[PDB]
Design a protein around this nucleic acid. Structure first.
Lengths: 144, 150, 29, 131, 129, 217, 35
RNA sequence: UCUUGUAAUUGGAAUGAGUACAAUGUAAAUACCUUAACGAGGAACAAUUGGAGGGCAAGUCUGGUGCCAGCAGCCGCGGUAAUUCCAGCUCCAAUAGCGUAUAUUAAAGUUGUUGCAGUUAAAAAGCUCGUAGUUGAACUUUGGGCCCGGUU
RNA sequence: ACCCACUCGGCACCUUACGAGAAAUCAAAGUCUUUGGGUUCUGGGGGGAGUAUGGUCGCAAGGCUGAAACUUAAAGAAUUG
């Protein structure tokens, strides 16, 4: 019993039944539709490059609050637009309009340390130098 | 269980564990064969012949006494019917229920029962035509089968 | 109390109480 | 259009990275033998894992199999030539029962300390490195 | 219907073992059930069995004595290459030193260690330990 | 000084009973924890979990302490203790008392061929308590007790050395896992091997033989 | 709300009988800033 | 009476990173192998990358900034949906490497042939008939005897 | 017609756990980590959604088949006051 075929010559039924079931997967469905090439922000990539379109001070709360605010960037290959989290404060003075930034993905979230509403693109580089090395005064941001 | 139903009865017969010669019978082995011949000349179906034999003359059944079944005796003497007993009775049942359904056009139960009877006929007729008792087509139709049975 | 009715797709009855208040699909060759 | 020189890696990172018993035993070994980092313990664990895998699928083969005879004799002869097993333990159930210290005892710094000449395994290693 | 007589025979023996009965009746019999029970009797896992003979297909009375852990059927009777045999044991036997998995080879109906001594293999039938 | 209050108490008090296999084979029951202390010494103890439990009345909220502990010396004899008392140390004492009262043994074995003082089990065995299932698999020599550190400690106090443990079920809980593992190792002792097919002498429950000096005063 | 979350999910651990860390002036602080 | 630790205590040893005659090396060179001579006393020839409520290893640390219709009164104390607002100390892991992003694999028995589940958690067609498809009762030479001959 | 004892086949019941389960409980939901008697359909976190598009039956009402983007860390069984 158990609700499946079990004959010695039933292998075709097991194959086809498994194919349909696999069509009710999630990652298989995302992959064999190739939807990581059509609707995703990245073209299936890891990073991407962009031009900072607008910067807004989206504070956590009203003035006595946490400084985690960021920008909307335009993708340079796709032409799409997306918000893209600048990291820890004191780096917003690095970022103004038109800075040719490099974006990556975000990753995880806990009950602290950033539970931002869907802003999942941490900026890795600004002006093609760095953001961490620019933060530790290792290098200076070039003038245009 | 039943082939077309939910019931699971087990009412049947039970042949004894004695393949030989009931002791008190001691009558004959061929004489009963000409009462087979006589009754088949009368026109009785083999089930009827068996039941009249065990009700009248003390024959338990012909397979143990004669050494042959009834149909091979009837076919041996050439009195075998064209289509066998059971298929003929199924066709007769289907015919009668279709005439009643012809008269009474609203009876959904007879329509369902007739579909059941037709499917039972089809299974049996396919069995017969794959064992070379009917011609290999035999074309069971809904109307002309009436002329086949009566 | 009473246990709520359970269904993956919302009933056509409940949608009537919800709803009161051209081009085909693309296939890039 | 020239062939590859083949390569592999002799070390293997552990499955659960952060276990106080494992960290403690690793640091105990490092102090007792004078190692540079955890890669040495990992490398001996990889060597031992290969040897135990060979021993397991040799023993699952039947007794008196010719492949079992040849490969087991080669393996046991090798591991007594390097001197990890004893002289009178030439059987496969014993080479299932090998410990990492039984391999680190047969190194160079452990021998050039144990044979005198160094009075300390750390001094032994730095005396090796200085040729 | 009764798609396999070895299956329900082995199931009946196992329910009679789990409950704590003494002897069990099996309907119907087969050649392969006789030979299976022959091997199981030879290895001591059951008591002694006796074939009640009517003309239909018979029945079997198996006189148990405890000391049997489990018996079962592996359906469908998969083809078993010889090197596959070990793998099959490691799938469904409680250990390697004890337990048996039973093959039907052309050299007869016979358990796996004798299948290796006679150096032959064939289809699988079931198992017992 | 401990005074016997039962039949096996009088049996063990004068030291006429020393071998624990007579107790195990006929399954002699025990209701006082002093029997194993006067019979098997050195039983190392270690604590699993002490947690506060709340019972809510009409107005009040009574707080008790549930203690689970383990007992086992080094060699094939284990006991688990579930108790709940009004005090933490009293709960530990009661738990270790019931753990020493419910000691069960272990039949060990070899993973493969037989050589030199067995180190593992003899059969893959199941244990279940509330949607957790511990499956114990014998393992080769020096392979390490591959279990969770609580369960690894359990088999380390048991006496086995290498057991593969595929466990299936929601293992966030501790008590269900420990109860399932306890039943698993108990049925591991209860799993019959054909090696015990030899003829056994079948004693006549030797409390009957020692009934002259174990009866009432 | 980080401090209150740690306060909520630390007291639950003691009811389960699990050892929990002590509290001080290091609980609800950014232990390591990001990049 | 012999063993570990500490010290702005002290002493002499060793050696290559480097510099470089030379020679090997090479089609010619560079670099490796060998080597004349030089080359270690701490800010030297200075090791980093991540982290520290539990997962998951390591703070009953320090200091600073901002608000409080809270006590005091100009010293301050405490709180601060400031998700700490910012720095330092100490500790943990890996190490000439360490982190991050995307994809994938194991842990996953969340694709389950081995190996899932369907009363109530997602999930047994309203019911029956029926073709392809899957699956399908038992039985036909068994037993006994004979030798020869191989292996532990 | 009734009673008594059997037997086959039905509809429900009472108790129990030798078993099973997350639990309520269940002679089946038992004979399942000691996992294989035959077979058909269904399911893969919640929303978007029985929504969109196409096909199809339907006079109509409608039914049948039936997604995707996006978003989100959530969405059964008993006891205790």
């Amino acid at each position: 019993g158990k609700g499946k075929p079990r004959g010695l010559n039933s292998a075709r039924k097991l194959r086809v039944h498994r194919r349909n079931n696999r069509w009710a997967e999630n990652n298989y469905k995302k992959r064999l539709l190739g939807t990581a090439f059509k609707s995703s922000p990245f073209g299936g990539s890891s990073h991407a490059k962009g031009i900072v379109l607008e910067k807004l001070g989206i504070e956590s709360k009203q003035p006595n609050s946490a400084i985690r605010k960021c920008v909307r960037v335009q993708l340079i290959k796709n032409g799409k637009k997306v918000t893209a989290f600048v990291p820890n404060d004191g780096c917003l003075n690095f970022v103004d309009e038109n800075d040719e930034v490099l974006l990556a993905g975000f990753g995880r979230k806990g009950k602290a340390k950033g539970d931002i509403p869907g802003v999942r693109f941490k900026v890795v580089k600004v002006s093609g130098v760095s953001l961490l090395a620019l933060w530790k005064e290792k290098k200076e941001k070039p003038r245009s | 269980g039943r082939m077309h139903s939910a019931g699971k009865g087990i009412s049947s017969s039970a042949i004894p564990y004695s393949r030989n010669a009931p002791a008190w019978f001691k009558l004959s082995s061929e004489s009963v064969i000409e009462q087979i011949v006589k009754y088949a000349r009368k026109g009785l179906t083999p089930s009827q012949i068996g039941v009249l034999l065990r009700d009248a003359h003390g024959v338990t059944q012909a397979r143990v006494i004669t050494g042959n079944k009834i149909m091979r005796i009837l076919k041996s003497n050439g009195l075998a019917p064209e289509i066998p007993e059971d298929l003929y009775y199924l066709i007769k049942k289907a015919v009668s229920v279709r005439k009643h359904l012809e008269r009474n056009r609203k009876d959904k139960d007879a329509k369902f029962r007739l579909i059941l009877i037709e499917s039972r006929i089809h299974r049996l007729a396919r069995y017969y035509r794959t064992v070379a008792v009917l011609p290999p087509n035999w074309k069971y139709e809904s109307a002309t089968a009436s002329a086949l049975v009566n | 109390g009473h246990k709520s009715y359970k269904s993956k797709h919302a009933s056509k009855g409940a949608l009537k109480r919800l709803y009161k208040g051209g081009k085909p699909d693309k296939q890039v060759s | 259009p020239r062939a590859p020189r083949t390569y592999s890696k002799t070390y293997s990172t552990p499955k659960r990275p952060y276990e106080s018993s494992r960290l403690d035993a690793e640091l105990k070994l490092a102090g007792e033998f004078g190692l540079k980092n955890k890669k040495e313990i990992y490398r001996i664990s990889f060597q031992l894992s290969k040897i135990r895998r060979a021993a397991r699928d040799l023993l699952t083969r039947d007794e008196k199999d010719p492949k079992r005879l040849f490969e087991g004799n080669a393996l046991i002869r090798r591991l007594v030539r390097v001197g990890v097993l004893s002289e009178d333990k030439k059987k496969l159930d014993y080479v299932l029962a090998l410990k990492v210290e039984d391999f680190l005892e047969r190194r160079l710094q452990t021998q050039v300390y144990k044979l005198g000449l160094a009075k300390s395994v750390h001094h032994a290693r730095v005396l090796i490195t200085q040729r | 219907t009764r798609s396999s007589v070895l299956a329900d025979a082995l199931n009946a023996i196992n329910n009679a073992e789990k409950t704590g009965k003494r002897q069990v009746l099996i309907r119907p019999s087969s050649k392969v059930i006789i030979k299976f029970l022959q091997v199981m009797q030879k290895h001591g896992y059951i008591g002694e069995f006796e074939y009640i003979d009517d003309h239909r297909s018979g029945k079997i009375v198996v006189q148990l004595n405890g000391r049997l852990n489990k018996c079962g059927v592996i359906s469908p009777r998969f083809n078993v290459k010889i090197g596959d045999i070990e793998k099959w044991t490691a799938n469904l036997l409680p250990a390697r030193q004890f337990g048996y998995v039973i093959l039907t080879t052309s050299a007869g109906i016979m358990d796996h260690e004798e299948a290796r001594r006679k150096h032959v293999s064939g289809k699988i039938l079931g198992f017992v330990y | 000084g401990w005074v016997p209050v039962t039949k096996l108490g009088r049996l063990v008090k004068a030291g006429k009973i020393t071998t624990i296999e007579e107790i195990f084979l006929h399954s002699l029951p025990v209701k006082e924890f002093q029997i194993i202390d006067t019979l098997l010494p050195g039983l190392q103890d270690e604590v699993m979990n002490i947690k506060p439990v709340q019972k809510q009345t009409r107005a009040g909220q009574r707080t008790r302490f549930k203690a689970v502990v383990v007992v086992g010396d080094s060699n094939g004899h284990v006991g688990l203790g579930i108790k709940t008392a009004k005090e933490v140390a009293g709960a530990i004492r009661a738990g270790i008392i019931i753990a020493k009262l419910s000691v069960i043994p272990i039949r060990r074995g070899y993973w493969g061929t037989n050589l030199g003082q067995p180190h593992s089990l003899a059969t893959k065995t199941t244990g279940k308590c509330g949607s957790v299932t511990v499956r114990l698999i014998p393992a080769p020599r020096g392979s390490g007790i591959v279990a969770s550190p609580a369960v690894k400690k359990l088999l380390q106090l048991a006496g086995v050395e290498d057991v593969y443990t595929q466990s299936n079920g929601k293992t966030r809980t501790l008590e269900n896992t420990l109860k399932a593992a306890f039943v698993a190792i108990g049925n591991t002792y209860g799993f019959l091997t054909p090696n015990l097919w030899a003829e056994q002498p079948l004693p006549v429950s030797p409390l009957d033989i020692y009934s002259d000096e174990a009866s009432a005063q | 709300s980080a401090k209150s979350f740690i306060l909520r999910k630390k007291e639950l651990m003691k009811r389960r009988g699990r050892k929990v860390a002590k509290d001080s002036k290091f609980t609800g602080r950014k232990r390591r800033h990001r990049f």
